[PDB]
Design a binder for this molecule. Structure first.
Ligand code: HEM
Ligand SMILES: NCCc1ccc(O)c(O)c1
Length: 444
């Protein structure tokens, strides 16, 4: 078969369709019009956007396709070097870092990060306790303070102290503006600003790395695990520059996807008072202590379904790219040559009615009551295979912990009847999402 293609702009091909503040949402509507697969061209490039489980299940075959650096990864490499998110699978550093870090990202390791995550989670609860009557919460704003701070502490025992600030730590300022300057190229002076922001970031990370080496200190952070770890295959440790790239990667790549998830989840729950009540009821039943234990977080199952359903509707890291390792036919109908690229459009996958049923636009956490009912590769918010999100257990333990506590400690009002507005950076979030809290007065 011959692939549909969206509207073209003379010599710029489909490029100007990406000249927009909301390009994922623009691609979703094209997929609505054109179906499970379309060709997208720009000067010098072509890729194909996939939307059906039928096709994505083959694109997720790792004997046939591997991770491609385009978009999210390629421009981000300018700040995260050959960290895990921005390295090709065949780069020696990717496989080294993968084998060394997998153990520090498992469910087991979350027990070691648990206390630092509760540290920051408590600051968030205390902030909201301490608002006056008539004040309100800026949700993605507070979520982003929390996830950056949690990553900083779990990653390299460094405190950005975001809940003490109107103006973020200069590193965060630099990293935010550096992701902005990366993302903005997707369509095209402050080149020396980027160079300054990179240098702010490296100098800080290399400092903490040297300081930790000089001190000999052992703590419960990822930096300790990186300075200590040896790859079983090569027998080598990571070098100091690579360790710095990983720390920046966890911050640049991990914080926003995770605050986005918390924000959408809260958005869905306030728009669906029956499901908020069910999740509040589980939080009260389970979180019986002043501060949550790791084990109690594992017990918040409904809260976990809530998060999964939020990720289904609005996967906050919304697309990833693959290349064909050899000539191959996709779907029985589309021949591809080696090197041919594909984009997996996750929010559209997650709306595949053949897989989810007809109610795909509905918020329904009970969909995830039995995960084995979901066909393979139908739900991919953490990507695929050996290149899937190393931070997934981190991200979900964090979101479950935090949502669980917010639900234990507060009732919520959508006091403005907020109209969803999805801002896109490298990630997705509900821009301007605001709520009022009313404390249940449960002491920490
Ligand atoms: C809800 C939050 C998150 C979502 C939805 C998410 C999603 C994803 C996705 C889709 C990819 C695949 C990218 C690709 O194929 O090009 C990925 C990779 C990755 N993510 Fe996340 N992520 C989240 C949180 C985090 C956190 C908290 C960390 C902290 C370390 C993190 C670190 C990474 C890294 C290092 C990779 C590359 C892994 C590899 O290729 O070896 N992520 N993530
Ligand atoms: N760790 C999440 C990093 C990330 C952010 C945006 C994306 O589109 C993506 O594929 C991955």
């Amino acid at each position: 078969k011959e692939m549909p293609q969206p509207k073209t702009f003379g010599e710029l091909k489909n490029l100007p369709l990406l000249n927009t503040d909301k390009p994922v949402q623009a691609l979703m509507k094209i997929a609505d019009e054109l179906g499970e697969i379309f060709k997208f061209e720009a000067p010098g490039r072509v890729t194909r956007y996939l939307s059906s489980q039928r096709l994505i299940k083959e694109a997720c075959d790792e004997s046939r396709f591997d991770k491609n650096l385009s978009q999210a990864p390629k421009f981000v490499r300018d700040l995260a070097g050959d960290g895990l998110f921005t390295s090709w699978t065949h780069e020696k550093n990717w496989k080294k870092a993968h084998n060394i870090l997998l153990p520090s990202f498992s469910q087991q390791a979350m027990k070691g990060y648990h206390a630092m995550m509760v540290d920051i989670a408590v600051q968030l609860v205390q902030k909201w306790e301490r608002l006056n009557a008539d004040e309100h919460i800026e949700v993605p704003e507070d979520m982003t303070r929390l996830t950056l701070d949690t990553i900083g502490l779990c990653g390299f025992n460094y405190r950005f102290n975001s809940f003490y600030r109107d103006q973020p730590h200069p590193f965060i300022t630099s990293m935010v503006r550096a992701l902005d300057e990366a993302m903005n190229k997707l369509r095209r002076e402050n080149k020396r600003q980027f160079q300054e922001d990179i240098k702010v970031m490296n100098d800080l990370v290399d400092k903490i790395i040297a300081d930790r080496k000089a001190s000999g200190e052992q703590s419960d952070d990822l930096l300790t695990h990186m300075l200590n770890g040896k790859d079983p295959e090569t027998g080598e440790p990571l070098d100091d520059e690579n360790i710095r790239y990983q720390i920046i990667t966890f911050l640049a790549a991990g914080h926003e996807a995770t605050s986005g998830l918390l924000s959408f989840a809260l958005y869905f729950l306030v728009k669906n008072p029956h499901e908020l009540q069910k999740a509040a009821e589980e939080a009260a039943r389970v979180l019986v202590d002043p501060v949550p234990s790791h084990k109690q977080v594992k017990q918040l199952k409904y809260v976990g379904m809530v998060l999964n359903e939020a990720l289904r509707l609005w996967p906050t890291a919304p697309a990833f790219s693959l290349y064909a390792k050899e000539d191959t036919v996709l779907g029985g109908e589309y021949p591809l040559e080696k090197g041919d690229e594909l984009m997996v459009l996750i929010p559209q996958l997650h709306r595949d009615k053949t897989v989810w049923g007809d109610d795909v636009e509905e918020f329904r956490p009970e969909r995830f009551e039995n995960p084995s009912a979901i066909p393979q590769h139908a739900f991919k918010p953490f990507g695929n295979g050996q290149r899937a999100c190393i931070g997934q257990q981190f991200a979900l333990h964090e979101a479950t912990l935090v949502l669980g506590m917010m639900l234990k400690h507060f009732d919520f009002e959508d006091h403005t009847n907020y109209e969803l507005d999805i801002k896109e950076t490298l990630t997705l979030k509900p821009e301007g999402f605001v709520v009022k809290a009313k404390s249940k007065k449960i002491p920490l």
